[PDB]
Design an enzyme around this catalytic site. Structure first.
Site, short mmCIF file in Angstrom:
data_model
loop_
_atom_site.label_atom_id
_atom_site.label_comp_id
_atom_site.label_asym_id
_atom_site.label_seq_id
_atom_site.Cartn_x
_atom_site.Cartn_y
_atom_site.Cartn_z
N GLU A 97 -6.56 -16.87 -17.43
CA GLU A 97 -6.16 -15.67 -16.72
C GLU A 97 -7.41 -14.86 -16.43
O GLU A 97 -8.39 -14.90 -17.17
CB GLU A 97 -5.06 -15.02 -17.56
N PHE B 118 -12.83 -18.50 -27.19
CA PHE B 118 -12.28 -19.25 -28.30
C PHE B 118 -13.01 -20.57 -28.38
O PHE B 118 -12.58 -21.46 -29.13
CB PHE B 118 -10.77 -19.42 -28.19
N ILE C 27 -19.35 -15.88 -11.91
CA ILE C 27 -19.37 -14.46 -12.21
C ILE C 27 -19.93 -14.21 -13.61
O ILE C 27 -19.84 -13.09 -14.11
CB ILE C 27 -17.96 -13.86 -12.16
N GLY C 28 -20.41 -15.23 -14.30
CA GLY C 28 -20.77 -15.03 -15.69
C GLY C 28 -21.27 -16.31 -16.32
O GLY C 28 -21.28 -17.36 -15.69
N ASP D 103 -16.39 -15.81 -33.31
CA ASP D 103 -17.32 -15.32 -32.31
C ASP D 103 -16.84 -13.97 -31.81
O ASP D 103 -16.93 -13.67 -30.61
CB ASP D 103 -17.49 -16.31 -31.17
N1 LIG Z 1 -19.78 -14.26 -21.96
C1 LIG Z 1 -18.68 -13.56 -21.23
C2 LIG Z 1 -18.14 -14.45 -20.12
C3 LIG Z 1 -17.01 -13.75 -19.37
C4 LIG Z 1 -17.43 -12.38 -18.86
C5 LIG Z 1 -18.41 -12.52 -17.71
N2 LIG Z 1 -17.81 -12.28 -16.41
C6 LIG Z 1 -16.79 -11.46 -16.10
N3 LIG Z 1 -17.10 -10.37 -15.40
C7 LIG Z 1 -16.10 -9.57 -15.02
C8 LIG Z 1 -14.81 -9.87 -15.25
C9 LIG Z 1 -14.55 -11.05 -15.93
N4 LIG Z 1 -13.23 -11.37 -16.20
C10 LIG Z 1 -12.79 -12.47 -16.85
N5 LIG Z 1 -11.52 -12.72 -16.95
C11 LIG Z 1 -11.31 -13.86 -17.70
C12 LIG Z 1 -12.42 -14.47 -18.15
C13 LIG Z 1 -12.39 -15.73 -18.91
C14 LIG Z 1 -12.80 -15.86 -20.34
C15 LIG Z 1 -13.74 -16.26 -19.28
S1 LIG Z 1 -13.84 -13.60 -17.65
N6 LIG Z 1 -15.53 -11.88 -16.32
C16 LIG Z 1 -18.03 -11.54 -19.98
C17 LIG Z 1 -19.18 -12.25 -20.67
#
Ligand SMILES: N[C@H]1CC[C@@H](CNc2nccc(Nc3ncc(C4CC4)s3)n2)CC1
Length: 292
Positions: free
Chosen positions: A97, A160, A28-29, A141
């Protein structure tokens, strides 16, 4: 040396393969240090987030130790909870989480928050930073991609991957660690630096929330670093589309002189933070909400 580094990490992560207790991994990211999936715990159906970071693909491998030790059992309301770390193949997985409402970045590039919402964000970040900074913990960061939201619009600090431990007796850091645009000038010029960099970085994030991007964004990273070093603190462009409280708050944050720059515990007492809305004032900002 890889093999040695892998071995050392084994000794500090939780034993086991998390694929035993987790399913439905879905990217998701992305970060600089690796990718983020969601997964689901087999036994309970609960959701978690999982950072995977290839040990062979890091700009600075040894940073990988920081998060997993520092936040091991730490549990603040405005910090994302780490549950477990594992070594899986040549990747480190950190089970965290899952935050529903996604990151501040999406909001800051698609809309212009009001000052109540901005205060809400800064209040929450500063709580996190107060407790953290008092334990010798520099995040390093702070930026809009490091701020996560719950579906009910509560705010938590994440990412972190770059943090550090200082101590009474050994005080400064010197390493060049961060995301360029948000870097404090003393860090850029690798002079001794400390906690106060996070405050500067929060300053830049407040300019993100106001102007839509950090200063010098249009510029390539290395040049921008030089520019923040050589220049004077950046000014808002929207000087007149903002209030004295906010301007006052900003000027405590974007001080070149680290010694004169404010501290988190100071800034909690700042009046600007008394405009901070409840969680629910954040919710209309979120992707799912702001377009009908
Ligand atoms: N570079 C950052 C990476 C995390 C995020 C990308 N994806 C994301 N999209 C929607 C919801 C979501 N929720 C999360 N919950 C906990 C999460 C734990 C720390 C990674 S990410 N994450 C935002 C850009």
């Amino acid at each position: 040396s890889h093999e040695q580094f892998r071995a050392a990490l084994q000794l500090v992560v939780d034993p086991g393969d998390p694929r035993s207790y987790l399913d439905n991994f879905i990217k998701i990211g992305e970060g600089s240090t690796g990718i983020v999936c969601i997964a689901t715990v087999r036994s309970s159906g609960k959701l978690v987030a999982v950072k995977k970071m290839d040990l062979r693909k890091q700009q600075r491998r040894e940073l990988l130790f920081n998060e997993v030790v520092i936040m091991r059992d730490y549990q603040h309301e405005n910090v994302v909870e780490m549950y477990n770390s594992y070594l899986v193949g040549d990747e480190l997985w950190v089970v965290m989480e899952f935050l529903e409402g996604g990151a501040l970045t999406d909001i800051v590039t698609h809309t212009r928050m009001n000052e109540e919402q901005i205060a809400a964000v800064c209040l929450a970040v500063l709580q996190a930073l107060s407790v953290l900074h008092a334990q010798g913990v520099i995040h390093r960061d702070i930026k809009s991609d490091s701020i996560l939201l719950t579906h009910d619009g509560r705010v938590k600090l994440s990412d972190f991957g770059f943090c550090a431990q200082v101590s009474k007796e050994v005080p400064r850091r010197k390493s060049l660690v961060g995301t360029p645009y948000w870097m404090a000038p003393e860090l850029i010029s690798r002079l001794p630096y400390g906690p106060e960099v996070d405050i500067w970085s929060l300053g830049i994030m407040v300019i993100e929330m106001v102007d839509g991007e950090p200063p010098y964004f249009n510029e390539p990273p290395l040049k921008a670093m030089k520019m923040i070093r050589d220049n004077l603190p950046p000014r808002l462009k929207n000087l007149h589309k903002v209030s004295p409280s906010l301007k006052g708050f900003l000027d405590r944050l974007l001080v070149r002189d680290p010694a004169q720059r404010a501290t988190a515990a100071e800034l909690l007492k700042h009046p600007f933070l008394a405009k901070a809305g409840p969680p629910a004032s954040i919710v209309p900002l979120m992707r799912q909400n702001r377009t009908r």
